[PDB]
Amino acid sequence: GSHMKLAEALLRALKDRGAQAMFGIPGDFALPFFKVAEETQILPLHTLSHEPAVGFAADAAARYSSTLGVAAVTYGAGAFNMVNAVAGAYAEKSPVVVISGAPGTTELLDTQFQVFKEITVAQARLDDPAKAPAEIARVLGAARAQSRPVYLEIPRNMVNAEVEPVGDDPAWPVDRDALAACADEVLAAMRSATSPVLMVCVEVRRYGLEAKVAELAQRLGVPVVTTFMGRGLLADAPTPPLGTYIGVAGDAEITRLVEESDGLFLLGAILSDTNFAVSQRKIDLRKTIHAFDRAVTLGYHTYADIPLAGLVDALLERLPPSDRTTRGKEPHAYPTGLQADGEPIAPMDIARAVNDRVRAGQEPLLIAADMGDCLFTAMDMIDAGLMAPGYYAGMGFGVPAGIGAQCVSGGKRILTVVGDGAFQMTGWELGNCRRLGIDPIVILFNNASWEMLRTFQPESAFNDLDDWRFADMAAGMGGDGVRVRTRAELKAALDKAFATRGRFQLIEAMIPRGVLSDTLARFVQGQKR
Amino acid sequence: LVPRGSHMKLAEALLRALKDRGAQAMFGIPGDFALPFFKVAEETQILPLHTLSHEPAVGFAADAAARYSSTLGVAAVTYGAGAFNMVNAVAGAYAEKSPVVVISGAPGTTEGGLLLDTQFQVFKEITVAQARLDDPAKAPAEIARVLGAARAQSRPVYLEIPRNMVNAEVEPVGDDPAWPVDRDALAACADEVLAAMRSATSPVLMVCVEVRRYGLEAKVAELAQRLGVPVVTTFMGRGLLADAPTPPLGTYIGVAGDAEITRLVEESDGLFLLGAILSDTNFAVSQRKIDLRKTIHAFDRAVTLGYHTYADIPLAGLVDALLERLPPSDRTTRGKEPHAYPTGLQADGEPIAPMDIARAVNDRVRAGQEPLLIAADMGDCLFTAMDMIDAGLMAPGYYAGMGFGVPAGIGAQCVSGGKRILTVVGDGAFQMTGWELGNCRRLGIDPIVILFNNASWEMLRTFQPESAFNDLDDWRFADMAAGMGGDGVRVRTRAELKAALDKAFATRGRFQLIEAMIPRGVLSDTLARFVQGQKRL
Amino acid sequence: GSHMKLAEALLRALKDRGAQAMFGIPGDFALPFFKVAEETQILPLHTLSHEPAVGFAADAAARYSSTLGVAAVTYGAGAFNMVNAVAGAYAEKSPVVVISGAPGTTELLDTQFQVFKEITVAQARLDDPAKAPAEIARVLGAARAQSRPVYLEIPRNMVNAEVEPVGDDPAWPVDRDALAACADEVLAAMRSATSPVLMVCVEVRRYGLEAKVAELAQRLGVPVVTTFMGRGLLADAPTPPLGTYIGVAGDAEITRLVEESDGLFLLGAILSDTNFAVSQRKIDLRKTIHAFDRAVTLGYHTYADIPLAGLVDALLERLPPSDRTTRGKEPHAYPTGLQADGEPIAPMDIARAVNDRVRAGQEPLLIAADMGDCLFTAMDMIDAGLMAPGYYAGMGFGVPAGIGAQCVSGGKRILTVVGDGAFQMTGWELGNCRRLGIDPIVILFNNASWEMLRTFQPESAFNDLDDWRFADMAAGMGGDGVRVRTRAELKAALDKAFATRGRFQLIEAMIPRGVLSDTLARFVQGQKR
Amino acid sequence: TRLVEESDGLFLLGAILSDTNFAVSQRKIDLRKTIHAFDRAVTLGYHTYADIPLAGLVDALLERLPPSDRTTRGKEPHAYPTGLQADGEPIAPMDIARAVNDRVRAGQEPLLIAADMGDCLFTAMDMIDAGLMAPGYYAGM
Ligand SMILES: Cc1ncc(C[n+]2csc(CCOP(=O)(O)OP(=O)(O)O)c2C)c(N)n1
Ligand SMILES: Cc1ncc(C[n+]2csc(CCOP(=O)(O)OP(=O)(O)O)c2C)c(N)n1
Ligand SMILES: Cc1ncc(C[n+]2csc(CCOP(=O)(O)OP(=O)(O)O)c2C)c(N)n1
Ligand SMILES: Cc1ncc(C[n+]2csc(CCOP(=O)(O)OP(=O)(O)O)c2C)c(N)n1
Ligand SMILES: [Cl-]
Ligand SMILES: [Cl-]
Ligand SMILES: [Cl-]
Ligand SMILES: [Mg+2]
Ligand SMILES: [Mg+2]
Ligand SMILES: [Mg+2]
């Protein structure tokens, strides 16, 4: 018989589901909601400067803990200013709960609702106190079940409406007969394949199925490969991945193994023609088994309403235990050996600088990367996780994602890599580190250029950018910046950054135009063909 | 048949069609799918190509350029993230009747799934017309149709160009197709409007946004003199008819404005809204504050009054029809300035308040400086700008979205032929898009920017002062200007403000950033009236 | 460069797609649209008395010619009063285009739009002249592709807006590889089955695939059976159906053949637990092949975007020609031999009366039946088609459907059978026959009872209805009515009705309570078990 | 009509607001000067009070007003048509109203009237009744 303000019921429902913080920027229509969030302290409230960062930070927080992210905005400009970040979270299967303030029920372009419907899997306007609890459960349940963003619009006069507490997600029971048929066909297909391959992908991480999938991989007995967004999965498994598939720029043997498989089990994979993703045009659709978005497709036919977790358990029930292991193999060889001299800096030198510290005893940091050669370089860095817009490829994610991740990392420092073009977009969010109580290390790749674009159209003058003095601007926003031009300066700056806590550390690495990471070089050489 | 032989690339035809319609530049940020299009733009130089740092600024700059010259604005982006990142700026342009032509690159017609097309569906919600130029034979007519729609309704439009179509040969783009015009309804409407104006006890003519967008100032000045009723402007009509025989008594902006003007408008029993946006946000004329039953609303090519709506009535046509029915008049209602601008800055050791910034600017003008056009962001900077003498004011007065300020000043100055722009912006808004100033050197511009730094989202504090989240940190913006190629100075006293403003005006060639420290709780007079007016109700 | 009023463009688009008439009831918001319809004469405009009849008549017209039906109503009460008829058309795969007038774009509960979205497959509010042509093509195209109702809302101020003519339906090209895979699996399943059965169902008729399916049936070589809504299909085919499956009340051999099949090919079937339909709980889901709603499901997996027509052509390409025929068999035995004496009337006597006339030389008439024992009786009548709510089971369809069908029959007379309860609902629509220029024969089964309900709960008094003198009321609404109590009177009345053209003929047959048709008797006996 | 539409203090105590048929329309009155008490809320002066039952608002107003013996009764405001001319002329809707009213004036206790939508409703407005039930706002037949 208890009841609470609608806003409080929502905040508690989010916390009940694992949310760790709420990022946001208020406005008139959202002020009452922000007041409840601040006064109740149910979720830590972190504000940022610009809405893109609110969305990227919530996305990063969701990815960091494989839970719900929370992004709060105000009606109109505020919400429209987060459309790109939300689209990116949708694209990369990250459940960001977008909460927008809205005009009261009694109160220029609804357009906003229509736009958000295009980039979320469920929406609700909480304008009826009696049904709000069920609607919140339905919408948050969809976010969790599909691992994609959702939209909640709260009229300002409803924030304080009394409602009953939010219950559990509505349960959608799987058809046992269909699941059995699905598991049987999938297993039969893997057994009939001359070259079966198990790809561990994004949904495995999002749904927290790492342990179950490590077990499945051991029992299935086929080669394991990860997709870009599955990087690091099963690293501690009995049969760790042979490597990561990233398309033309990756290991040739891995690329062929994936593309020539006649039993390619895409366990939770996002398919697209984007650079690093598994593309339908490069694989055998007559033999691929795509388990994704609560469905399983093979031989052009689909089993509906098959959650990934259920499929994995069904396969385990049909497989005998195994003690097989492949861990006696040699570990991956990362680029190391930075020559700390007076020579200029190349992207690979940044990778070597980071890797050398790790080899010398530094526990690796999780890396947040923006889109650009910084990402191609980060791929060769030893990390405690990599968070980047590898498929969506939108710029601006980097710095805000590092900030969002460190806000929920419980003390673990984050390393962010970002190019000059991307920094001009959202790097300024670092001015918020002092209030947030964080101190990320940021390596800014400054080549005074939109280099990825120059690489593919070198004759154009518009890719030449001005020389912005980012390191000189760091103090103005509360951080310690240093511009480095030589490998010796780079080595020294990285050590100093790790030795200095309390303020964000910005290392502005000057890189000449035309100098690329090894992976980007291979990508370019690959396209030419 | 597939076109062949025109020796004109689709992209070139589009750039030329835009130039034919008055476009003065193209702002944009490239990406893979848009590279071929940007190559044509750069190589042909049909329109000056200006790049910016972040897409919001591309949209705001294009919007500002459109507003500055009452023409088409052009914003070029790449498919996906690039385009989605400009949705807010485009929605703002739609909201304030500014024709921004959005041109997005797209996958080639024979190419090919991360979302769910999603992009087209989103843009269709914030534009008046759209076209995917994937058929060279139909491209010319589609361009004319879409650009024609932008000009007919003064709203943004969307053009999506598959990258393999950029260089496809096409025939030249013709003129805009004609929109419906009901001559019979026009005549009947004109008669009814005049009858309503004549019978009203307190009629009022409001000169609004469409009058400026459609270049009707001269015709409306003539109409105002002949109609013989009190004249007032809306926020977006501010400045119109200033030199006319019957100039506006003032600008209506709701409770925040002059009490006499507000009363005149809200008590009118014959309110003729000539081209007005009707909305309940910020400074817009609100359907909830006036009596729609006694209102004549001419907008979006229609006219509503007496419980009925006349369709297919272009504003220019209605004005001409009214003039044909009114005899000439020598009526003159000019007099000494209606709105008294604050002057007399006390250049001493006291802290700075928003009104001191208005006095500093106004004193320079009164001393002989030709006023600059002002670009303002949303915040107390806008409320303060209402009391500044200007050569035009560009701001999100209705949409109220932050981030517009600095990019708008940049876009306007790119097309101003050297006329310097004065930008006013708060600390919260500068944190969003003020960084775009780093592009001034390459763009060859040097705007003056007054940053109101109260370490606060102050407008929100006025609405909910109990909240701690409106307190912002100390950002040393002036100290960051050099890294962006400009001159910055932080000022704390009125004397420092006076000196810095003079130095900024005396120094061209580099943008000038004056970071004015202002205490929390100190508001412009207009924002103070706005806040008090809210409480009263 | 030509353009026309939006309303005219819609009417022509409907006529282009085969629509033969428009049924409707106007109101303030729809008056301008009705004016265009009346003045242009593009489609004959037929008004009725009450909206249920408008919907049932449009549904019947659609069914009669396997084309689009058109039902025009006014905003509010008018449209809400047609929700049941539209739901029934949706339930039975009939493409009724609902056109509602609406407030002008510049102008108590939108609720109406939301309600119609629940019972239609596509909707559009034509409030933008520039996009109206494409929206009309999209919505009408959905009606044709899915064979279900659609909704078009036209603001009154848009009726006369100038628009470009409507083009063709947007084309949704089928994936050739998926179709090939589907056809291969289906054919392999039919060949591996020990008892394959081809069921010809509603979509075969709706999409005009009778000739193609007759060919498929001959080449496939398996037994053919029809569903209730497939009654009469392939009657003239090389291998006509062995019979019609209608559940427990049908032929035992047919019921078992269907239910025990391990290769049940449901070609275009509506599945449901309703009386006469094929139910998922009575068949083997591990062996059923369900081709319906543009998909094909077997073994719990589904091939998407497979139009029925495409599937049939794909199977024909994989089957060799055949000269096989089963037409040497004995035809169906219908009840005949009415004893025209002084004894009371039973439902089977009505069937015998109708069948005897046919055996004596009368070309059979298409029969429109309402829900009740009249339908169970009609199942044993020789017809030129049977139109009834066999699956939806909603009352009131009968008389209006007969009226709608005769409006588009090009001179062919229609026979309607209806119970007293159903007649009290919509039988009054017969008052419109004079204006419509039609003269259907209507046999009203009057047992002063909701007999189907008494059969299952005989102890209830509320199923006892009063004695309404329907025949006595016929003249008041322009028809010739006669009440008959004996078999001799029945025989004479039916002959007189057929001999009298110009006015509807109402034969009110008095039937005692407790006297049922043979099929209903079997149904009841079946449920008991 | 003039009294209502020109009012600068229109207190709508429990009114349905709609533009259909006989309903009070937001387009005919000045909402700025209207006090709308309906659906357990009260709207006026550009703001809305929530959770206000109509019975509660009435009681609260009574508590703030002193008793009064004010009386504004007078001879019937609406003149009902009477005097049916019972002759050979055809029937018009007003004749039906006169027939009904004449019976009442002659001593018949009025009956409650149920009316459908159509001129029957417009005619019933001029009939003496013991209540009138009709779809006056919804206008459904
Ligand atoms: C929001 C957004 N706008 C534009 C692009 C197109 N784009 C892809 S790479 C690139 C250049 C990035 O420059 P930078 O951040 O300096 O890294 P670099 O290419 O020099 O390594 C651009 C503009 C994008 N991906 N996202
Ligand atoms: C894109 C966007 N996000 C949020 C808001 C809500 N908002 C309106 S005023 C304001 C504070 C502005 O702070 P500032 O720029 O420092 O100017 P001040 O109010 O202090 O004068 C905010 C966040 C908005 N209008 N637009
Ligand atoms: C619209 C609707 N309302 C109620 C029912 C429930 N119902 C099914 S059969 C029946 C009785 C029909 O009586 P009648 O038309 O006289 O035919 P009978 O049963 O006597 O053969 C009823 C009320 C229905 N199917 N449809
Ligand atoms: C269910 C429904 N359908 C259609 C209408 C539209 N309508 C309003 S008045 C009218 C005509 C009513 O005719 P009638 O009952 O004979 O009364 P009359 O207008 O002749 O006085 C119609 C069809 C409606 N209000 N309700
Ligand atoms: Cl993946
Ligand atoms: Cl305006
Ligand atoms: Cl069927
Ligand atoms: Mg760069
Ligand atoms: Mg501020
Ligand atoms: Mg009966």
Among residues B356, B378, B521, the alpha carbon closest in space to that of B454 is found at B521
The whole-angstrom separation of Cα D135 and Cα D115 is 8
Among residues B125, B40, B110, B35, the alpha carbon closest in space to that of B79 is found at B35
Alpha helix segments (H runs only) across B202-324: 209-213, 217-227, 259-266, 315-324
Tokens of C451: 């007999």
The whole-angstrom separation of Cα B44 and Cα B40 is 6
- Distance, in angstroms, between B306 CA and closest chain D CA? 10
Cβ neighbour number for residue A461 with a 10 Å cutoff:
9
Helix, strand and coil content of chain B, in percent to the nearest 5, comes to 40, 15, 40
Tokens of B11: 């992209």
CA of B472 to the centre of ligand 9 (A): 8
Residues of chain D found within 8 Å of residue C78, distances taken between Cβ atoms: 140
Tokens of B312: 């297919």
CA distances for C442 relative to C368, C505, D52, angstroms: 9, 6, 58
Among residues A129, A58, A134, the alpha carbon closest in space to that of A96 is found at A58
3-state secondary structure of B403: coil
The residues near D48 (Cβ < 8 Å, ≥ 6 apart) are A104, A106, A157, D41, D42
Question: What H or E segment, with its residue span, contains residue A481?
Answer: strand A480-484
The residues near B479 (Cβ < 8 Å, ≥ 6 apart) are A473, A475, A476, B488, B490
The whole-angstrom separation of Cα A2 and Cα A133 is 13
Last residue of a domain, one of A334, A360, A380: A334
The whole-angstrom separation of Cα B56 and Cα B410 is 13
Cβ neighbour number for residue D118 with a 10 Å cutoff:
11
D43 with A104: Cβ contact below 8 A: no
* Pocket lining: B248 vs ligand 2, CB cutoff 6 Å: no
Closest residue, chain D, to C108 (C-alpha) = D18
- Pairing, β A22-24 against β A505-510: unpaired
The whole-angstrom separation of Cα C290 and Cα C269 is 7
Tokens of C481: 């009515």
Q: A453: buried, middle or exposed (CB in 10 Å: 19+, 13-18, 0-12)? A: buried
Closest residue, chain C, to A175 (C-alpha) = C300
The whole-angstrom separation of Cα C438 and Cα C504 is 7
CA distances for A340 relative to A164, A415, A487, A488, angstroms: 63, 21, 5, 4
Ligand 4 neighbours, Cβ below 6 Å, are C 25, 27, 51, 74, 77-78, 81; D 117-120, 139-141
C-beta separation of A138 from A163 below 8 A: no
Cβ neighbour number for residue A213 with a 10 Å cutoff:
29
Dihedral over alpha carbons A38, A43, A46, A51 (to 10 degrees): -100
Residues of chain C found within 8 Å of residue A299, distances taken between Cβ atoms: 181, 185
Q: Whose CA is nearest to atom 19 of ligand 4?
A: D118
Q: How was this structure determined?
A: X-ray
Q: What is the DSSP letter of C496?
A: H
Cβ neighbour number for residue C327 with a 10 Å cutoff:
10
Q: If you compute the radius of gyration of chain D from its CA atoms, what whole number of angstroms results?
A: 20
The whole-angstrom separation of Cα D98 and Cα D109 is 15
Amino acid present at A357: R
Cβ neighbour number for residue C299 with a 10 Å cutoff:
19
- Ligand 3 atom closest to the Cα of residue C420 is 16
Residues B223 and B116 in one domain: no
Amino acid present at C160: N
The whole-angstrom separation of Cα C350 and Cα C343 is 13
Cβ neighbour number for residue C320 with a 10 Å cutoff:
5
Alpha helix segments (H runs only) across A83-196: 83-91, 111-117, 132-146, 176-192
Which residue carries 């919007």 as its tokens?
B63
C106 with B180: Cβ contact below 8 A: no
Tokens of A42: 């149910």
Tokens of C401: 């459907």
- Pairing, β D113-114 against β D132-133: parallel
CA of C67 to the centre of ligand 7 (A): 17
Phi-psi region of B462 (alpha: psi -120 to 50; beta: other; left: phi over 0): alpha
Quote the Cα angle for A153-A154-A158, to 5°. Answer: 160
Residues of chain D found within 8 Å of residue B292, distances taken between Cβ atoms: 27
Helix, strand and coil content of chain A, in percent to the nearest 5, comes to 40, 15, 40
Which residue carries 């510290």 as its tokens?
A357
The residues near C176 (Cβ < 8 Å, ≥ 6 apart) are none
Among residues A338, C525, A89, A356, the alpha carbon closest in space to that of B84 is found at A89
Q: What is the DSSP letter of A475?
A: G
The whole-angstrom separation of Cα B423 and Cα B309 is 40
Q: Interface of chain C against chain D, CB under 8 Å?
A: 76-78, 80-81, 107-108
Residues A368 and A303 in one domain: no
The whole-angstrom separation of Cα B189 and Cα B161 is 42
The whole-angstrom separation of Cα C449 and Cα C528 is 22
C-beta separation of B360 from B345 below 8 A: yes
Shortest CB distance from D27 goes to which of B288, B307, B537? B307
Cβ neighbour number for residue C167 with a 10 Å cutoff:
12
Q: How many domains does chain C have?
A: 3
Residues B355 and B313 in one domain: no
Q: What are phi and psi of B23, to 5 degrees?
A: -55, 140
Q: What is the DSSP letter of C171?
A: P
- Which residues does residue B450 pair with via DSSP β-bridges, in sequence order? B424, B514
Residues B117 and B81 in one domain: yes
Tokens of B18: 């835009």
Q: Is the dihedral of CA C409, C410, C415, C420 positive or negative?
A: positive
Q: Whose CA is nearest to atom 8 of ligand 4?
A: C27
The whole-angstrom separation of Cα C321 and Cα C171 is 31
Annotated ligand binding at B362? The verdict is: no
Residues A327 and A364 in one domain: no
CA distances for C229 relative to A421, C217, C400, C406, angstroms: 65, 18, 19, 20
Among residues A375, A493, A484, the alpha carbon closest in space to that of A441 is found at A493
- Which residues does residue A154 pair with via DSSP β-bridges, in sequence order? A101
Residues of chain C found within 8 Å of residue A186, distances taken between Cβ atoms: none
Alpha helix segments (H runs only) across B285-426: 315-324, 354-366, 380-385, 405-415
Dihedral over alpha carbons A177, A181, A187, A188 (to 10 degrees): 150
Q: What is the DSSP letter of C396?
A: T
Q: What is the DSSP letter of B352?
A: P
The whole-angstrom separation of Cα B530 and Cα B379 is 12
Report the CATH number that the domain containing residue B239 is assigned in CATH: 3.40.50.1220
Last residue of a domain, one of B162, B180, B198: B180
3-state secondary structure of A494: helix
Q: What is the DSSP letter of A442?
A: E
Residues A454 and A353 in one domain: yes
The residues near B50 (Cβ < 8 Å, ≥ 6 apart) are B25, B26, B27, B28, B61, B414, B443
C-beta separation of A365 from A413 below 8 A: yes
- Distance, in angstroms, between B329 CA and closest chain A CA? 37
The whole-angstrom separation of Cα A308 and Cα A144 is 13
Residues B114 and B217 in one domain: no
The residues near B186 (Cβ < 8 Å, ≥ 6 apart) are B310, B313, B317, B318, B321
Amino acid present at B535: K
The whole-angstrom separation of Cα C134 and Cα C129 is 10
Tokens of A401: 């994602």
b/e per residue A274-284 (b: at least 16 CB within 10 A): bbbbbbeeebe
3-state secondary structure of C252: helix
What chains are in contact with C, requiring at least 3 Cβ pairs below 8 Å? A, B, D
Tokens of C278: 């094929």
The whole-angstrom separation of Cα C24 and Cα C35 is 12
The whole-angstrom separation of Cα B174 and Cα B168 is 18
Query: What's the 3-state SS for C274-335?
Result: CCCCECHHHCCCCCCEEEECCEEEECCEEECCCCHHHHHHHHHCCCCCCCCCCCCCCCCCCC
**Resolution to one decimal, Å:** 1.5
Phi-psi region of B163 (alpha: psi -120 to 50; beta: other; left: phi over 0): alpha
The residues near B18 (Cβ < 8 Å, ≥ 6 apart) are B26, B47, B72, B74, B101, B147
Amino acid present at A164: E
3-state secondary structure of A284: coil
* Pocket lining: B429 vs ligand 2, CB cutoff 6 Å: yes
The whole-angstrom separation of Cα D104 and Cα D102 is 5
Residues A305 and A223 in one domain: yes
Residues B22 and B90 in one domain: yes
A151 CA to centre of own chain:
19
Residues C140 and C206 in one domain: no
C-beta separation of C523 from C275 below 8 A: yes
Cβ neighbour number for residue C117 with a 10 Å cutoff:
12
The whole-angstrom separation of Cα B286 and Cα C339 is 82
Q: What DSSP string runs through B417-461? A: TT--EEEEEEHHHHHHHGGGGGGHHHHT---EEEEEE-SB-HHHH
CA distances for C179 relative to A113, A295, A300, C317, C419, angstroms: 37, 20, 9, 12, 46
For chains A and B, what is the number of CB pairs under 8 angstroms? Answer: 198
Could you give the maximum distance between any two Cα atoms of chain A, in Å? Answer: 73
Query: What's the 3-state SS for C507-526?
Result: EEEECCCCCCCHHHHHHHHH
Among residues B138, B127, B124, B311, the alpha carbon closest in space to that of C162 is found at B311
Residues A399 and A494 in one domain: yes
Among residues B526, B516, B533, the alpha carbon closest in space to that of B386 is found at B526
Q: A193: buried, middle or exposed (CB in 10 Å: 19+, 13-18, 0-12)? A: middle
Which residue carries 């690489």 as its tokens?
A455
Q: What is the DSSP letter of C345?
A: P
Among residues C28, C39, C56, C30, the alpha carbon closest in space to that of C4 is found at C39
Annotated ligand binding at B258? The verdict is: no
C-beta separation of B199 from B334 below 8 A: no
The residues near B341 (Cβ < 8 Å, ≥ 6 apart) are B358, B362, B387, B388, B389
The whole-angstrom separation of Cα C492 and Cα C505 is 13
C-beta separation of D25 from D5 below 8 A: no
Dihedral over alpha carbons A425, A427, A429, A432 (to 10 degrees): -170
The whole-angstrom separation of Cα A99 and Cα A32 is 13
- Pairing, β D10-13 against β B49-51: unpaired
The whole-angstrom separation of Cα B521 and Cα B162 is 52
3-state secondary structure of B96: coil
Residues C305 and C358 in one domain: no
The whole-angstrom separation of Cα A241 and Cα A253 is 13
Tokens of A10: 């929502």
Which long-range contacts (C-beta less than 8 Å, at least 24 apart) are formed by D67-76?
Answer: none
Domain limits at B414?
342-537
Among residues B425, B423, B448, the alpha carbon closest in space to that of B509 is found at B448
Query: What's the 3-state SS for A212-280?
Result: HHHHHHHHHCCCEEECHHHCCCCCCCCCCCCCECCHHHCCHHHHHHHHCCCEEEEECCCECCCCCCECH
Q: Whose CA is nearest to atom 8 of ligand 2?
A: A27
The whole-angstrom separation of Cα C302 and Cα A303 is 6
C-beta separation of B90 from B60 below 8 A: no
Question: What H or E segment, with its residue span, contains residue C176?
Answer: helix C176-192
Phi-psi region of A221 (alpha: psi -120 to 50; beta: other; left: phi over 0): left
Q: What DSSP string runs through C109-164? A: --HHHHHHHTT-S-EEE---TTTHHHHHHHHHHHHHHHTS-EEEEEEGGGTT-EEP
The residues near B530 (Cβ < 8 Å, ≥ 6 apart) are B254, B255, B256, B383
Report the CATH number that the domain containing residue B82 is assigned in CATH: 3.40.50.970
Residues of chain D found within 8 Å of residue A157, distances taken between Cβ atoms: 48, 50
Which residue carries 């559990």 as its tokens?
A168
For chains B and D, what is the number of CB pairs under 8 angstroms? Answer: 14
Pocket test for ligand 1, best of A451, A515, A520 (most atoms within 8 A of CB): A451
Tokens of A384: 């405690």
Among residues A213, A253, A251, A248, the alpha carbon closest in space to that of A230 is found at A213
The whole-angstrom separation of Cα A6 and Cα A132 is 8
Last residue of a domain, one of C301, C334, C367: C334
CA distances for A427 relative to A392, A431, A474, B30, B499, angstroms: 19, 9, 10, 19, 32
Annotated ligand binding at A51? The verdict is: yes
